[PDB]
Design an enzyme around this catalytic site. Structure first.
Site, PDB file in Angstrom:
ATOM      1  CG  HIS C  49      32.707  70.837  49.945  1.00 26.65           C
ATOM      2  ND1 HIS C  49      33.847  70.124  50.047  1.00 26.65           N
ATOM      3  CD2 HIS C  49      32.617  70.614  48.624  1.00 26.65           C
ATOM      4  CE1 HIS C  49      34.373  69.501  49.109  1.00 26.65           C
ATOM      5  NE2 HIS C  49      33.435  69.880  48.135  1.00 26.65           N
ATOM      6  CD  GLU C 186      27.071  70.077  43.274  1.00 32.42           C
ATOM      7  OE1 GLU C 186      27.506  71.382  43.129  1.00 32.42           O
ATOM      8  OE2 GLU C 186      26.224  69.768  43.741  1.00 32.42           O
ATOM      9  CG  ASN C 211      29.866  67.697  37.223  1.00 33.38           C
ATOM     10  OD1 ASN C 211      30.494  68.615  37.993  1.00 33.38           O
ATOM     11  ND2 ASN C 211      30.616  67.285  36.266  1.00 33.38           N
ATOM     12  CE  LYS C 216      28.789  71.224  39.899  1.00 29.42           C
ATOM     13  NZ  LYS C 216      30.262  70.343  39.877  1.00 29.42           N
ATOM     14  CG  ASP C 220      30.321  74.197  40.482  1.00 30.07           C
ATOM     15  OD1 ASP C 220      31.603  73.797  40.682  1.00 30.07           O
ATOM     16  OD2 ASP C 220      29.488  73.842  41.682  1.00 30.07           O
ATOM     17  CG  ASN C 221      32.529  71.462  37.140  1.00 33.42           C
ATOM     18  OD1 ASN C 221      31.323  72.038  37.637  1.00 33.42           O
ATOM     19  ND2 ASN C 221      32.986  70.324  36.973  1.00 33.42           N
ATOM     20  CB  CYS C 225      37.909  76.672  39.139  1.00 32.96           C
ATOM     21  SG  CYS C 225      37.313  75.181  39.901  1.00 32.96           S
ATOM     22  CG  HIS C 331      36.099  65.073  45.019  1.00 32.06           C
ATOM     23  ND1 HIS C 331      35.160  65.959  45.636  1.00 32.06           N
ATOM     24  CD2 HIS C 331      36.082  64.096  45.714  1.00 32.06           C
ATOM     25  CE1 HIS C 331      34.498  65.600  46.551  1.00 32.06           C
ATOM     26  NE2 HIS C 331      34.941  64.418  46.675  1.00 32.06           N
ATOM     27  CG  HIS C 381      32.902  77.093  43.255  1.00 26.06           C
ATOM     28  ND1 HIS C 381      34.446  77.097  43.170  1.00 26.06           N
ATOM     29  CD2 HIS C 381      32.326  76.208  42.597  1.00 26.06           C
ATOM     30  CE1 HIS C 381      34.816  76.333  42.561  1.00 26.06           C
ATOM     31  NE2 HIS C 381      33.672  75.638  41.980  1.00 26.06           N
ATOM     32  CB  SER C 389      26.030  74.086  41.712  1.00 26.51           C
ATOM     33  OG  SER C 389      27.116  74.681  40.960  1.00 26.51           O
ATOM     34  CD  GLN C 393      22.915  68.142  44.235  1.00 33.93           C
ATOM     35  OE1 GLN C 393      21.983  67.308  44.422  1.00 33.93           O
ATOM     36  NE2 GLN C 393      24.176  67.487  44.204  1.00 33.93           N
TER      37      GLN C 393
HETATM   38  N1  LIG Z   1      37.471  72.304  43.808  1.00 32.46           N
HETATM   39  C1  LIG Z   1      36.274  72.516  43.326  1.00 32.46           C
HETATM   40  O1  LIG Z   1      35.282  73.376  43.817  1.00 32.46           O
HETATM   41  C2  LIG Z   1      35.830  71.744  42.012  1.00 32.46           C
HETATM   42  C3  LIG Z   1      34.781  72.007  41.219  1.00 32.46           C
HETATM   43  C4  LIG Z   1      34.268  71.012  40.312  1.00 32.46           C
HETATM   44  C5  LIG Z   1      35.058  69.827  39.965  1.00 32.46           C
HETATM   45  N2  LIG Z   1      35.990  69.645  40.924  1.00 32.46           N
HETATM   46  C6  LIG Z   1      36.698  68.426  40.572  1.00 32.46           C
HETATM   47  O2  LIG Z   1      37.769  68.631  39.713  1.00 32.46           O
HETATM   48  C7  LIG Z   1      38.262  67.372  39.077  1.00 32.46           C
HETATM   49  C8  LIG Z   1      38.218  67.756  37.615  1.00 32.46           C
HETATM   50  O3  LIG Z   1      36.880  67.861  37.254  1.00 32.46           O
HETATM   51  P1  LIG Z   1      36.572  68.143  35.715  1.00 32.46           P
HETATM   52  O4  LIG Z   1      34.980  68.676  35.631  1.00 32.46           O
HETATM   53  O5  LIG Z   1      37.402  69.501  35.164  1.00 32.46           O
HETATM   54  O6  LIG Z   1      36.636  67.037  34.892  1.00 32.46           O
HETATM   55  P2  LIG Z   1      37.265  67.029  33.221  1.00 32.46           P
HETATM   56  O7  LIG Z   1      37.331  65.686  32.661  1.00 32.46           O
HETATM   57  O8  LIG Z   1      36.394  67.749  32.498  1.00 32.46           O
HETATM   58  O9  LIG Z   1      38.702  67.412  33.346  1.00 32.46           O
HETATM   59  C9  LIG Z   1      39.859  66.604  33.669  1.00 32.46           C
HETATM   60  C10 LIG Z   1      40.867  66.655  32.604  1.00 32.46           C
HETATM   61  O10 LIG Z   1      42.150  66.115  33.088  1.00 32.46           O
HETATM   62  C11 LIG Z   1      42.899  65.638  31.906  1.00 32.46           C
HETATM   63  N3  LIG Z   1      43.900  64.726  32.571  1.00 32.46           N
HETATM   64  C12 LIG Z   1      43.535  63.473  33.006  1.00 32.46           C
HETATM   65  N4  LIG Z   1      44.796  62.848  33.792  1.00 32.46           N
HETATM   66  C13 LIG Z   1      46.014  64.033  33.399  1.00 32.46           C
HETATM   67  C14 LIG Z   1      47.123  63.622  33.515  1.00 32.46           C
HETATM   68  N5  LIG Z   1      47.564  62.840  34.257  1.00 32.46           N
HETATM   69  N6  LIG Z   1      47.895  64.956  33.052  1.00 32.46           N
HETATM   70  C15 LIG Z   1      47.218  66.182  32.567  1.00 32.46           C
HETATM   71  N7  LIG Z   1      45.778  66.150  32.580  1.00 32.46           N
HETATM   72  C16 LIG Z   1      45.130  64.887  32.947  1.00 32.46           C
HETATM   73  C17 LIG Z   1      41.832  64.986  31.147  1.00 32.46           C
HETATM   74  O11 LIG Z   1      42.434  64.875  29.958  1.00 32.46           O
HETATM   75  C18 LIG Z   1      40.605  65.987  31.425  1.00 32.46           C
HETATM   76  O12 LIG Z   1      40.490  66.726  30.267  1.00 32.46           O
HETATM   77  C19 LIG Z   1      37.426  66.280  39.438  1.00 32.46           C
HETATM   78  O13 LIG Z   1      37.989  65.884  40.397  1.00 32.46           O
HETATM   79  C20 LIG Z   1      35.996  67.207  40.193  1.00 32.46           C
HETATM   80  O14 LIG Z   1      35.364  66.480  40.877  1.00 32.46           O
HETATM   81  C21 LIG Z   1      36.447  70.497  41.919  1.00 32.46           C
HETATM   82  K   LIG Z   2      32.309  80.906  49.388  1.00 32.55           K
END
Ligand SMILES: NC(=O)c1ccc[n+]([C@@H]2O[C@H](COP(=O)([O-])OP(=O)(O)OC[C@H]3O[C@@H](n4cnc5c(N)ncnc54)[C@H](O)[C@@H]3O)[C@@H](O)[C@H]2O)c1
Ligand SMILES: [K+]
Ligand SMILES: NC(=O)c1ccc[n+]([C@@H]2O[C@H](COP(=O)([O-])OP(=O)(O)OC[C@H]3O[C@@H](n4cnc5c(N)ncnc54)[C@H](O)[C@@H]3O)[C@@H](O)[C@H]2O)c1
Ligand SMILES: NC(=O)c1ccc[n+]([C@@H]2O[C@H](COP(=O)([O-])OP(=O)(O)OC[C@H]3O[C@@H](n4cnc5c(N)ncnc54)[C@H](O)[C@@H]3O)[C@@H](O)[C@H]2O)c1
Ligand SMILES: NC(=O)c1ccc[n+]([C@@H]2O[C@H](COP(=O)([O-])OP(=O)(O)OC[C@H]3O[C@@H](n4cnc5c(N)ncnc54)[C@H](O)[C@@H]3O)[C@@H](O)[C@H]2O)c1
Ligand SMILES: Nc1ncnc2c1ncn2[C@@H]1O[C@H](CO)[C@@H](O)[C@H]1O
Ligand SMILES: [K+]
Ligand SMILES: [K+]
Lengths: 461, 461, 460, 461
Positions: C49, C186, C211, C216, C220-221, C225, C331, C381, C389, C393
């Site tokens: 990004h 990441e 990650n 991180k 971050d996550n 968010c 993602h 973020h 984060s 890296q």
């Molecule tokens: N937007 C951002 O800035 C940002 C930041 C970090 C991660 N992400 C992305 O967010 C996503 C989630 O990452 P995470 O770190 O929280 O992973 P995670 O595995 O910690 O969280 C995902 C959760 O979703 C649940 N899940 C899976 N399928 C489901 C369904 N059909 N219904 C309900 N729950 C379900 C799983 O049980 C799991 O607990 C990934 O795609 C990650 O790459 C985005």
């Molecule tokens: K920002």
């Protein structure tokens, strides 16, 4: 005929209005109830109120109720250009551009009173008292009173010069317009305070409805509204991380309270300043460290003023502040911060309503909206839903003073509780909030009817 | 002479008073300020107020001001025995036991008026209005009015019997005592409502100070107190896990507001009921699902009433409840829940103030303090600090009505704002909360003085 | 270089001046490794990004000696003024807010096309797109049938881009694959992809899973968010949070952050989950745990955070009420069945905000066409959390470039002492004063006063 | 055949159980699911674990699944006598009396291995590792190693004396008992530590399940449990008001995190100390000021320790504290606070588990539970729901080892994630939490099966 930034933004404005209406059941219910009846037919309303999408929904509601209106914003940075365009495109005269100069601002305040047929306005819808003050100072100047000398501020000089231009262009205007006003509805605390000053000195020549002090205004708008839009404005302005940061909130009234919850809810640790011991005790009880800005300034990450007062954040405070501290104001007027004192320092514009101010010693500050209400200047003000509660009161206030003018004397009024209750009731369904109904016996037992009102006149909620 | 559970608890009582005093700067400031001048010399005060450690500090404070007092509790379960004992041990007559019967309760109420020199009390300090009503209804009975027939409750019947009893033993007593009361101060919402009923009927024969509606009472005690003390009572009574549970709070006034915070802040998920649309909208805005108990009863884990109304939790609701649902009341009187209607079923005592009530289908409920104020019944009510703000008003109320009786008519008054602000001011230091001082220009600017008051008479805070 | 408007550079530069004061981790790394130049000779292809935060990272990598070429990892996540500022330095960047899919994949290929004709030697990846491009391309070149039966429109474009590259410069994929010393990844979704590769024996070089650094995944996550979800929903819709019901799909790191985001802003949060432990956490945190099947029809906001697919379906979207807001912060844009909406009447409201109308007249407000709405509708973020984060890296790049021979073809995480160092570096900014263990205290709990303080698999 | 304090208290024990069971859905659901299949038929379990009502429900669960059991407390004071009685009334051998001698303690540990058919145990369920170490040390002694000489403590001489008593009484007992243990489960960090050292020195002669590190047990005890019981303990002890107060929490691990939430949720303002920079950064990000007790002691109102270290709150900190500061420990298990260092100052007992300590200058402190665990000392430990999650882990571990002994090496293993997940599932229904099910397509997409486990071995949740 109209002054907006860009009339091509109308379509965008219109789309967002389609959305806002689904968020504003209060105003839409007023269109249903009073559309055919047309209680404001014959009303000639000059509005001075942040030209936002929300205000646009109000404006169109007033029109559905029979009114003709002319509109301008009550702040130079608070306008939403597409809202202004969408209103202008209906043919309703609007004078509002986000980022207008002070001279323009007063030109526009004047324009809301200049009707095509050359007859005056008969109603004012005000937010902050700028439109009301303009007429009343004008009229006194016209009566020979010496009220346009010794200007305290730049903004005041500009207001004076505008009164002078109007006196010269059309003599007798102010006098004639002061007499034509059936009544004024005032939206905000700072405005209401100006009204009480007038009344106390015998200078209010027509009735005013104090809309700010409806419970469904002051305890919702001023509090939840700021909870929603304060952090919003800071975020859009600076994109700063809230978690881990210390934010000092100057003041703990309705706005101050909302502001603290805004910051706390985002993860900032909040400190509060106050002069009222009761409000200060509240802040401490609410979990916040109560400090003075003299003591807390040099370690704050964010400093926000909410007081309605002046010289709250001074040049002495700002010298103590650390590099990159964020400074902003969400009270009605820009003098809460001593911005004028910073003008001799080096400014670097970052982007609209975001400026970097550099002190002799290399320390930088981030100033938001040049010290003006940052929620409206850096973002979009309060969301539609809460504005619906406020604006429904506005509509009721306009109906009262226009259709029942003889019931009122030259003083400041508030709406009766049954109306306040009505306004809240109109917003319940939208949230799927199910209200319980008192049995005849339960109502008897606590001294009310099942229909309400449910509280004594001065209950505080 | 006195009636307490066990006089040997006095030492413990005393040790908790030494601590409690450090938590009640409002009361300690009053001792410093009025100790030597003794404004209450010659006061003969009959007190009806939960006999707790907090009330004990109040009692000693009134004595330090010159007052002689006779005390009883205003609820059968709210006494703290060791506090009662410490007070009895100073020689102050006190008649309060935790877990007294109804008969005993009224016997004690009567005792607070029986001075050893045979002379009547000249002041009342009341909470709930029980002591006031007793004198007034008794007096009316003595004048030949038919006020002692057709009793509605078991509680009403025992009050009538006690009145008759006293009339026979010492004829003229009620009338001679009614006449001798210079004034009453009233602590709580429910009592204040009784007072307003009286005044309205022309049945208030002396001045009353409505202590409840001091800002530093209602917006602190009633809100923050219950926040502290509602779950306190539920935990001590049940040791239930809060996180994961759904609680239903009936009513969203000052107590419901604090009750909701109490539960949410402990991890429970809170639904709210209301009959007032403004209070409901506040609850929805505060992030709570607003429901009717009819709809929500069957799935709730905890159900609590905070209304001061009656028949809020009915037999129909309790039938729908799920096994082991906890039910409690934190409003002033035990009729909010339909406990009488449960007397029919199988009770099993679990421990003091905790009963397991079993329905025909085998569904069990846990009832707290037999449906009386659970904060005070199952724990110890509000902490000292908050009661200090509340009780410092009481002391000011007594000083007014006792030293300036001729300035007051037979009406319900509230203290002036400057006194309200003083009370808050006296609690700031304890919390390290440092107040800002208005410059002369700043105060002028907003229309106040640097010494306050800082808000208009009806500001809601 | 390809950016929206190079005249934004000055604006971008001013926000970099600000961002730097918020990102002490990166600035510390400049101090520590600037003179020593550990990445001198590094040729890094970055797919992440193109925000102001990424711009501070990019300049940090250059302070450390690296040459880079950069592209964003999402078509809507670029901040044009950041892209511009970076381009103005002479660093090749290819990133425009609102790029097409075709443009996206043209830019991903560009980050590997160096002027001297030689290949890159490192990849800094977010989501795995740049890694997959090289790996799938090299297999196609080796004759494997990996460019058929495309399952999405985006997949089709990827296949055509690969075919286009093979035609222009035959052998590019094979040579680039072999030239990569290592990749740093990441995000959760990207790492998941790496594990799939390793399990199949298709990972040809070492990868650092950035990650799963505690500093991180647990910052971050989560906090990220917390800050940026509601941000994105406010800027897109200006909706009132108080009084509304928001359904959060998933309760992992992101779902947890997201719930805090909405609750702290006033919304009442309900949560869905497939993982019983995560669900129990949601319930313990005070949230009603529901299925979207059940909750869909009364929600005001619905947000997916799973990294899975087909979470919010056409059937759910049919049930939703008029003006319900729908967005995704995982993602990829397939968590929501956006494609199933494509034959319906769409009205654009403004960038990344669309009103979608069903046959019965019910309208939905979709954010960022189903892509990460925090980066799409706002700016992602805040700098501070990204400093954490991005410092991971930097350390990961230094590892795989300077010590490549110490790693096998597997997914590794950074050691705890580096994780602790990253946290440490961010404490002062916040005025957080750390306590120091006495020699006896350390001994008493089985650590040294210098740390590491926790066992290898302490969960925090 | 059984040792309890009073077989008479058994009916009351049972009445307590009936209530507690409704709050332990985990163990109860275990009984409904596995009751019929009897996966523990043939099990002969030697249990050593605080003999409380909660543990009684665990016990009866083990029997429902077919297990035969002998039980003792893992602590001399933790036994709740009516629980023991209720359990001995079952016909189950229980050897536990609150306040038992150290000698008697070890004699009861021995007794859990003495079955009337003369054959040995085949499973140990253990908290702390005393029951495991007794068999293993004894067997090392019977193999001729010198391990009963050089006792470090007089508490250890009781151990050694107790093994020689048993050795002398029944030669070979230990060698034959060691050979017969199929597996052991361990509940606590200390018990695991001992085992992992056995393993590193090839002294572990059978599989062990480490239950402490289950997500559903480490999180539930450490964080959620302490969240529920910290503020509760402090209220029962001092009745202090939380709102307005500054609380310093020492340490920000699981117990610290829960403690911070308990305090902040009750209205206190939380500061946090730490030595671990990751945890510290967590604390600052959660919106708490991160400080050293050195700097924060003089202005704290409450200081609570949660580190599991020693010399955390020292005499030097306690000298700096303000008057009436409340001081407590929720870590483990004495020595976090330098209580002994205070033994020369004037102590005034206020009531059980609450002591006023006065310094030379008149500064007092309020000390809870003499600096031992306060949630147990001033409250009633963790709620039943919490313990249900944690005891369900023991069950599943027992089934796992007993039924798949062959699949396990003689090492320490953590509970398999699918069982950890199973524990969670077992508690979902009571909460009304409804789980979603992955389609087969969704499951493959993310790399799992629709049945779970859903996360990788070292996912941190
Ligand atoms: N937007 C951002 O800035 C940002 C930041 C970090 C991660 N992400 C992305 O967010 C996503 C989630 O990452 P995470 O770190 O929280 O992973 P995670 O595995 O910690 O969280 C995902 C959760 O979703 C649940 N899940 C899976 N399928 C489901 C369904 N059909 N219904 C309900 N729950 C379900 C799983 O049980 C799991 O607990 C990934 O795609 C990650 O790459 C985005
Ligand atoms: K920002
Ligand atoms: N931006 C918005 O959307 C918005 C909305 C409503 C009101 N306002 C404006 O905000 C201002 C405040 O409104 P309010 O409703 O909170 O009024 P308020 O009177 O309820 O509260 C103002 C508080 O500031 C305190 N104060 C005054 N001087 C101070 C000082 N020098 N230091 C610290 N505290 C001080 C006062 O004691 C008072 O409690 C007014 O200008 C009002 O018009 C703005
Ligand atoms: N136990 C304590 O520590 C304590 C402290 C203060 C007051 N009280 C008592 O609590 C009671 C409530 O006092 P308050 O100060 O909150 O007064 P309040 O009037 O502010 O609150 C009562 C609220 O209950 C609502 N209500 C009335 N009937 C209802 C019904 N049938 N269903 C749902 N809601 C209903 C009303 O709309 C009102 O908003 C009074 O009896 C008061 O004396 C107890
Ligand atoms: N009271 C209870 O109900 C209960 C329940 C479970 C555990 N405990 C006890 O609580 C203690 C902590 O348990 P935990 O699960 O949080 O373990 P933990 O290791 O997760 O938490 C310990 C934390 O304390 C910090 N710490 C160590 N020394 C410190 C110091 N001098 N100053 C500040 N911080 C310091 C460490 O950095 C670590 O983060 C253990 O002794 C445990 O047995 C008590
Ligand atoms: N989005 C908005 N549109 C119109 N008026 C607003 C908005 N947000 C806040 N206000 C009003 O502006 C006043 C502050 O000057 C407040 O009284 C408030 O009611
Ligand atoms: K808005
Ligand atoms: K108390």
């Amino acid at each position: 005929s109209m002054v907006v930034k860009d009339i091509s933004l109308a379509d965008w404005g219109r789309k967002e209005l389609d959305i806002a209406e689904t968020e504003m059941p209060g105003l839409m219910a007023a269109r249903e109830e009073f559309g055919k009846s047309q209680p404001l037919k014959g009303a000639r309303i000059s509005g001075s109120l942040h030209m936002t999408i929300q205000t646009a929904v109000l404006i169109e509601t007033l029109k559905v109720l029979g009114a003709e209106v002319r509109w301008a914003s009550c702040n130079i940075f608070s306008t939403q250009d597409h809202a202004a365009a969408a209103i202008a495109a209906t043919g309703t005269p609007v004078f509002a551009v986000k980022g207008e100069t002070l001279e323009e601002y007063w030109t526009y305040t004047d324009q809301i009173f200049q009707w095509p047929d050359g007859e005056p306005s008969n109603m004012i819808l005000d937010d902050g008292g700028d439109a009301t003050m303009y007429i009343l100072i004008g009229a006194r100047a016209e009566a020979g009173e010496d009220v346009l000398s010794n200007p305290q501020s730049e903004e005041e000089e500009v207001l004076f010069a505008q009164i002078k231009k109007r006196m010269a262009a059309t003599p007798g205007f102010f006098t004639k317009q002061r007499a034509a006003i059936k009544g004024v509805t005032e939206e905000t605390t700072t405005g209401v305070n100006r009204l009480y000053q007038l009344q106390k000195k015998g200078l209010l020549p027509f009735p005013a409805i104090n809309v700010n002090d409806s419970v469904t205004k002051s305890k919702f708008d001023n509090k939840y509204g700021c909870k929603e839009s304060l952090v919003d404005g800071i975020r859009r302005g600076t994109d700063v991380m809230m978690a881990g940061k210390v934010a000092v909130v100057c003041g703990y009234g309705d706005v101050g309270k909302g502001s603290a919850q805004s910051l706390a809810g985002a993860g900032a640790r909040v400190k509060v300043t106050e002069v009222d011991p009761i409000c200060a005790l509240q802040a401490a009880m609410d979990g916040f460290e109560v400090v003075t800005l003299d003591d807390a300034a040099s370690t704050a990450d964010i400093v926000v003023t909410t007081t309605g007062n002046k010289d709250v954040i001074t040049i002495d405070h700002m010298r103590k502040m650390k590099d990159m501290c964020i400074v902003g104001n969400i009270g009605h007027f820009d003098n809460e911060i001593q911005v004028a004192a910073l003008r001799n320092l080096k400014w670097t514009n970052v982007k609209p309503q975001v400026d970097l101010i550099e002190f002799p010693d290399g320390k930088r500050l981030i100033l938001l909206s040049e010290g003006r209400l940052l929620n409206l200047g850096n973002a979009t003000g309060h969301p539609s839903f809460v504005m619906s509660a406020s604006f429904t009161n506005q509509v009721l206030g306009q109906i009262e003073l226009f259709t029942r003018t003889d019931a009122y004397k030259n003083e400041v009024y508030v709406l009766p509780k049954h109306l306040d209750e009505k306004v809240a009731r109109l917003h319940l369904d939208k949230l799927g909030a199910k209200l319980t109904v008192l049995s005849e016996e339960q109502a008897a037992y606590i001294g009310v009817t099942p229909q309400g009102p449910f509280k004594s006149e001065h209950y505080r909620y």
